[PDB]
Amino acid sequence: PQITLWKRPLVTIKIGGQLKEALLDTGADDTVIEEMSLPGRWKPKMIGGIGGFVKVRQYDQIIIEIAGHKAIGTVLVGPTPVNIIGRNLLTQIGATLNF
Amino acid sequence: PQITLWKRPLVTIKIGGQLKEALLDTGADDTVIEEMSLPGRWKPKMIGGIGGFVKVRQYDQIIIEIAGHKAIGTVLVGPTPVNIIGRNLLTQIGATLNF
Ligand SMILES: CC(C)CN(C[C@@H](O)[C@H](Cc1ccccc1)NC(=O)O[C@H]1CCOC1)S(=O)(=O)c1ccc(N)cc1
Secondary structure (H helix, E strand, C coil), X not given: CEECCCCCCEEEEXXXXXXXXXXXXXXXXXXXXXXXXXXXXXXXXXEEECCEEEEEEEEEEEEEEXXXXXXXXXXXXXXXXXXXXXXXXXXXXXXXXXC | CEECXXXXXXXEEEECCEEXXXXXXXXXXXXXXXXXXCCCCCEEEEEEECCEEEEEEEEEEXXXXXXXXXXXXXXXXXXXXXXXXXXXXXXXXXXXXXX
């Protein structure tokens, strides 16, 4: 698909058996999802943006289905106001910015 | 151009005659620039990011060149980890996300 940016680029994802809406965000280095349980080991991380930093849990080797495409990578879980698909997974689905 | 996302999508912008680096950010509704002098009056705006809400200065109808493409629109000035080009100006330069 070709997604225009007149509105927020929101897509459905499936993660841990759950359907969520997420923003495709080229300015996010990594994917961060609202609080949920994920399998496996995690370690703490701080991520920062407008308004400062938030503490998240970093899970590796997580599979997400993004607008029907599967990708695997690191997912950060924490108190984000919006689910964000970041570059670490956008690359895997072949997403590019074009102008 | 086509910009892939293996690295941060950093481009050169020109604003006030000065070259700056900025991040193309589909997850940002608005464009946010580090502190600098811009002409004209400003009005208050609250924007929310991952860490919370913050007050910034809104300048309307500012001329900015982004990776060689001319835009004229709203620029917010405030404490930002990086200059961010948001959807309000990505749409003016015709940017789309493709996968
Ligand atoms: C600020 C950029 C450099 C980094 N952020 C991504 C941005 O796309 C961010 C995404 C977002 C949208 C809505 C609410 C909360 C966050 N939009 C954003 O702040 O919009 C503001 C700036 C002007 O318009 C409004 S991030 O969320 O802090 C972040 C940082 C690290 C990772 N791993 C994940 C995300």
